[PDB]
Amino acid sequence: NAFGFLRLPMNFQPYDSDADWVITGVPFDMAGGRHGPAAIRQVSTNLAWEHNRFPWNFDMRERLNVVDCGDLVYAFGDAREMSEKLQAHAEKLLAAGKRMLSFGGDHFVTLPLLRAHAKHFGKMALVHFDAHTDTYANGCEFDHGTMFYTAPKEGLIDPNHSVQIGIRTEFDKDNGFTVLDACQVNDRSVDDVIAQVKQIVGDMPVYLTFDIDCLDPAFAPGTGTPVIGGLTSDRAIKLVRGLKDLNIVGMDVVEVAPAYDQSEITALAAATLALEMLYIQAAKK
Amino acid sequence: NAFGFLRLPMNFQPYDSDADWVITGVPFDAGGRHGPAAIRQVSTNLAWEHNRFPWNFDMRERLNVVDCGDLVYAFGDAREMSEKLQAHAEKLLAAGKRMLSFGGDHFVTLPLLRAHAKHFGKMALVHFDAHTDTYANGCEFDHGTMFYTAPKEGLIDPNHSVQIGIRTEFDKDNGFTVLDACQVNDRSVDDVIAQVKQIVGDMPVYLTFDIDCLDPAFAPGTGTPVIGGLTSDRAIKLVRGLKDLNIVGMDVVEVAPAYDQSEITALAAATLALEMLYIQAAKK
Amino acid sequence: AFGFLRLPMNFQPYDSDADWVITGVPFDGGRHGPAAIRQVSTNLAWEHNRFPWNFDMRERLNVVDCGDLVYAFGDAREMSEKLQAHAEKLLAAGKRMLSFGGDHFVTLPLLRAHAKHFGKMALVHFDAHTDTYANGCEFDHGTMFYTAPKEGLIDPNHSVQIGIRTEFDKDNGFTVLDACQVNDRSVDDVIAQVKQIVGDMPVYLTFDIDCLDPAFAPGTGTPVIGGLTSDRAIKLVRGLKDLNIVGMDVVEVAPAYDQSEITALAAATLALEMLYIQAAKKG
Amino acid sequence: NAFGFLRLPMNFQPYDSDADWVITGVPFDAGGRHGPAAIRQVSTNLAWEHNRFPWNFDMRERLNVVDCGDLVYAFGDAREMSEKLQAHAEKLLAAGKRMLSFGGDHFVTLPLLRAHAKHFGKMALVHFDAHTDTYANGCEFDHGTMFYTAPKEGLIDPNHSVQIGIRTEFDKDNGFTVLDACQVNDRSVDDVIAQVKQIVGDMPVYLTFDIDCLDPAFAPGTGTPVIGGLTSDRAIKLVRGLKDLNIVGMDVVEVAPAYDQSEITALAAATLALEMLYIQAAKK
Amino acid sequence: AFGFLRLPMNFQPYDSDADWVITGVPFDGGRHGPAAIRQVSTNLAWEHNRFPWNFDMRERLNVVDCGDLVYAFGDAREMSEKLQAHAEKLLAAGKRMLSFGGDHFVTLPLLRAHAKHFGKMALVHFDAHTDTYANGCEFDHGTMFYTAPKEGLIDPNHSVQIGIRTEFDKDNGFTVLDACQVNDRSVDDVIAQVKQIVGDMPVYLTFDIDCLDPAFAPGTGTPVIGGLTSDRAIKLVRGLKDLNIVGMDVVEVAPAYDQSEITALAAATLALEMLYIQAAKKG
Amino acid sequence: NAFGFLRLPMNFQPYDSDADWVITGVPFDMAGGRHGPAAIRQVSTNLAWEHNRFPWNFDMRERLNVVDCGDLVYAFGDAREMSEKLQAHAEKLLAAGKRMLSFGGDHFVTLPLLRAHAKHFGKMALVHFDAHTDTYANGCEFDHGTMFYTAPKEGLIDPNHSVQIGIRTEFDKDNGFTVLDACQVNDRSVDDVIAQVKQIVGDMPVYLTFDIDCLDPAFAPGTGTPVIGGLTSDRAIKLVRGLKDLNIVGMDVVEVAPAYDQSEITALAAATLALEMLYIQAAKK
Ligand SMILES: [Mn+2]
Ligand SMILES: [Mn+2]
Ligand SMILES: [Mn+2]
Ligand SMILES: [Mn+2]
Ligand SMILES: [Mn+2]
Ligand SMILES: [Mn+2]
Ligand SMILES: [Mn+2]
Ligand SMILES: [Mn+2]
Ligand SMILES: [Mn+2]
Ligand SMILES: [Mn+2]
Ligand SMILES: [Mn+2]
Ligand SMILES: [Mn+2]
């Protein structure tokens, strides 16, 4: 109570709660993204004092019952156990009617989530903010750059209605994934880019995943794999806000590595983005 | 002598000096006390330029600026800081001097507004910040309440005031014109300045600049950060675009050196401060 | 596997199958610039094709890193002389130079060696400063582009200075594209004007990292607010492909003032782009 | 559940729990608010040890410890923090629980002393700090005045109290025995502990630990640092040497994470905290 | 001039006039340990005779640095196998090893190679942890000195563990000199007991940097308060001269958590002492 | 006024003031010791609130008129001008009857000071706290490791009554300088070491110079040339305090490089040592 993200209530038995949205922390890397959820929670008090978060004219916590269920408990080193307890957690939540905002953690945390969400929402469109496309063909079982190769192959997402925003590194130009790379995103208007995004997604249900490395290192230095020429936090937030009218079933923010943060501005970016992900959900009501 | 901000002369008895502009540091409340120190130390970066770019003249040739050090007051006592600070300002103003002031908590502006209102009348406030600082029901010494109190005491006129760079909850119905960061970041400097001049009119202006207006990327060293702010480039051009307004006093506040990174925030504040001085000099 | 971008170290590069040689020049807190740049560059090494390129620079050029220049602990005079000798023998053997600072001063020896082998050059200069101070000490950064034209090394009248944010001289023949306008103009616009100024002349490309705004390059000794973004820096560099760049360096990185290695990463990324735009013209 | 300090259970309704010891965080005033957060985050470093060295048993097997989170109070209001904090403590104490408390400003101890005095009588204070915190003429909410006020309100008896690690000006004439850092650093642990036991007697003890007691080399993360302090090794052995005293409550305060370096200070505090728990457990 | 302590790099060290070879083993935030250690070591290089010694180690041993071990980005199994192969071929050619971590796990391959060439060894272990966990993952730091005795690589009964500050097993044959007593006893006292435990057996010297108190070595991934000072660490290492040390490593340095480079400097200084005490016995 | 070190009065015209002791800052390196005096001043407020600085039972500022004259103004790059304006400054102060506590800055700052002091006090005994002996035979004209070679050769100090405390690096064992190296200093009692110091110095006038690198890097990380195995701040302060009965004519603290400081603990060590240097002067009265 008054102890989680944004001073929301902790509830460690959330499956039968009245919550609409459950926040879950997943401290996991396989560096230093393990403390991402702690850092995000700790800095979110910056945001909590606004009754109506700018620029909105209503309070999210009045339109949505959001609870923080803490962090996922699993064997210290084991990633298989992480992955299985994460998908299990996610399935039990979805079956109870709840929706998920999730804090990472390694981006790999997303595969368990997509798997669980796919069972309840069908094949999904992926809106992916990152500097990496994370479609690596031959990597380790738990590599965090291989999950959006594995997800289409397991029929979890449809590349042909997915969009990858802020890319700045080598990628495969023929996946059916539409790559809106940081170069053009930075040189195009937010409206322009949202228009193109909406055209691709359709009315398909969306999973929204945001690796913080998508922001330029100056705006978000606290990440393990930085790439220069990224987005501003102002552009990120405007883009996220522009996704209001999509059918976003679930969402997560990942790769925040507090050990490389500077005066918390990377955790602040994640907490503000996570809150915007909530407000756009509340604004559809 | 050669020891204060920008290697300007220290003068701890400025009231009868032949200085036009007096720099005053006010170390007051986290940890924005070293704001003035940080600003002065980093300012030597700028001092070597004879004509600070992009100006084609030397501010120091057109204006006598002296740095009078920091305001002495009972260490924790805030009611002393205010009375000592207003008195300082009143005596400087009566002697014909003008003030560039370094914070320090943003609250320090309210004493300076009281002092300035007695000498210049009701003012227009040009307010760069991420917060509107109009909180109605707060502690008498809360930093985010100065622009609720000031209109109520008749110091400033909301209806010619403007609040630039806002990124947090505010009050749309109170007379202040709020140019939010979302907007300012998407609009040209000329567009915004035009609008600023429209609202302000011919009226006299007190310019207050809370560094949290700048995005934490450029001003990480602040106590209450908000993402999606202004760049240093935009902040400096906007400030430079107020040349033609009647700016009677000015301050830069909320630099918390504990959270600064490679002295970036203090550099921005000192640069902005210097630009505030050139605006004055380019009219003389 | 051990030098910049996991390239081969070759401490005997004068006779070698390499077409380009990377040389660290630790010199003054920019001693450690070259180390910082190498260490962070592994972030880029894993990309077969460095985005947004369509091929691997490593398959179009043999590039080797011969380490750092050895000179007397404090003697800058030996530093200069051993630096210019180093280049003269590299440039002599039909090998090019990407060099890492280090003090910006390091460019002046390199310009002396380059002028003997390519003639008077156009200077493409990324910096917040113009570095043209006449009445300055013998070994001093800032003064090089007063000395270099008087020694007939570069032609101011085809030289361009990009990102300037500080006091400078308007009447000396250098074209200054200050950070105020560079940030308000399109890259294409600026590149067009660069190409117009330089013409067909061989260019030396020098990049003082303070050109970037301190938010992006905090790790610098002489920082100035209101500079360029890394995005704009990289697009401008990339836009110089069609010019004839004979030599290039990246200087002023100071790790003691770096934050989460972002200055070093910006310099390593720019340096890699300087290599790609070379590889772009040979293939 | 598995979420609080040392991965212990959270329980936000601890008053009727079957817990022996309750951990409470009090975020209050620079920037010692994140003291509790910092302590909890770093504490996982210790949690993996089943028998925390050098003990030959597991504290968690002998004691039910729960973490009840942080004290909620009106954000800036300090008079609320005190009344809410004393009430919290009184209700826990009446229910038979004992308190390990994380600061937070050192001032938080005075409410906890009021609560404890009602349940345990007048106490002996064992006080590790670089400051004596006995300032007579201060603000009602000044951190360095709690051990002037507490004797005057009859909460503690100076004549069985001891102040360990002092490195700054103090008052020799007020009943407290002051073991200065110069002395403690030159004397064996057994020597000092002998003396501590002599002074304290059989009387009940409240153990308060301000982290600035540790030399800034080991606890850089503090707001008022003083050189020539204690090592973490000496601090932990001294604390461990109080096993036989009747310690009724305990706290660790003044961890300012903004000034911490690689989480060293928070680690020391959490380790010391855990040792405070083992002292209790080794008597049960 | 480019490796540790400005020693020569030699990427082909198997046939070389060197008697000792320095090898970085970047492995997991200890990837960057070896770099950090090399970069800071120049602080020591300028001393002809490293204090308090009466001669130059560099004039009694040929020491070279062959860089870092090349292995698959994430495959630790290849890391181990290429590491043990590396050592087996070095130890085979009559060359010794000072190695830099890197994860402490790196020692286990090195112990496998060393045991084949020197037999079962006494372990002199500086760490806050005993690293004897039985029921742990295949590749995991902490478990090595459970695996190493079961594989007959070391003899617990002549092995000593110095600086322990955490849970451990009292009954397994290892002699634990915990940081509580080590800090309360004289170096001579402790060295005497070390010499008594080890006897005439060949020793492998492994130094996990968390042994030092976090105040002295902040840059570590698993820190524990109440550890050793660098002064005491260096005096203890120095006191092992008369023992027969066949191989040595320094591990767990994590720069992401270092403060003003003091952890790296402590490790580079210890490593240099490990070299002097070798040079002490040959001259 | 109330603006210098320890909130003491600034006085930029100190030669004819009533001060006994003048504090002078010398921002100079030839890295990053230039801001040493600023850092020292800024952190000294930590100390200023104690009326009687522990462990003393009197107030220094009651027994001594101490003023801070600011920093020495000279040509930005030129060290010759630094050196000459520094010695000139020092001579004018000494001739006026004033005594000097000086903040560095590069250790080289000491040569101008010794030169000026020698003219007024004669040949001096040097009490030197540092990890380096600074007796380098062949270095640059302004090398900061060569000044205590140059000073005996110019007849400024007598090595045979000088003592070098906390040494941890290669030095020349036959200078007549008595080296009390950190190894033994750390293993010997403070009384023991002071006794030996007093025996060597005699009643000769002492210049006390303290390079902060003498402290172990953990206690004082903010220096350019660190060496491990140094002294604690507690031992440094006790030793300095033990020099009360020597005839210390002048004093300085040098090499504080704020760019490598951690939470100001290096500047705090210098400011506390500098204050102790003042209290021992006041305690003889
Ligand atoms: Mn990414
Ligand atoms: Mn990703
Ligand atoms: Mn604000
Ligand atoms: Mn404000
Ligand atoms: Mn520059
Ligand atoms: Mn330059
Ligand atoms: Mn205290
Ligand atoms: Mn206290
Ligand atoms: Mn360990
Ligand atoms: Mn270990
Ligand atoms: Mn030294
Ligand atoms: Mn020295």
Author numbering:
A (entry chain C), F (entry chain C): 15 to 44, 50 to 304
B (entry chain A), D (entry chain A): 15 to 43, 50 to 304
C (entry chain B), E (entry chain B): 16 to 43, 51 to 305
Publication excerpt:
To obtain the structure of EcAGM, we carried out crystallization tests in the presence of guanidine (Gnd) chloride 100 mM, obtaining crystals in two different conditions. Two structures in different space groups were solved by X-ray crystallography, one at low resolution (3.2 Å), including a guanidine group; and other at high resolution (1.8 Å) which presents urea and agmatine in the active site. These structures made it possible to understand the interface interactions between subunits that allow the hexameric state and postulate a catalytic mechanism according to the Mn2+ and urea/guanidine binding site. The solved structures in complex with guanidine and urea provide insights into the catalytic mechanism of the EcAGM. The primary interaction of guanidine occurs with, His126, Asp153, His163, Asp230, Asp232 and Glu274, whereas urea can interact directly only with Asp153, Asp230, and Glu274. In prior studies, Asp153 has been proposed as a critical residue to form an H-bond with w1 and guanidine moiety, suggesting a critical role in the orientation and stabilization of the w1, allowing an optimal attack on the guanidinium carbon. Also, Glu274 has been described as critical for catalysis and guanidine motif binding only, E274A mutant has only 1–2% of the activity of the wild-type enzyme and increase the KM values for agmatine and Ki of guanidine, but do not alters the Ki for putrescine, indicating a role in the union and orientation of the guanidine group. The structures with guanidine and urea made it possible to propose EcAGM’s catalytic mechanism and provide evidence of the importance of His163 as a proton shuttle and a stabilizer of the transition state in bacterial ureohydrolase.
Agmatinase (AGM) is the enzyme that catalyzes the hydrolysis of agmatine in urea and putrescine, and to date, E. coli AGM (EcAGM) is the best agmatinase kinetically characterized. AGMs belong to the ureohydrolases enzymes family, containing all the conserved residues of this family similar to arginases (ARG), proclavaminic acid amidino hydrolases (PAH), guanidinopropionase (GpuA), and guanidinobutyrase (GbuA). The hexamer as oligomeric state tallies as is described to other bacterial agmatinases and arginases from bacteria and plants.
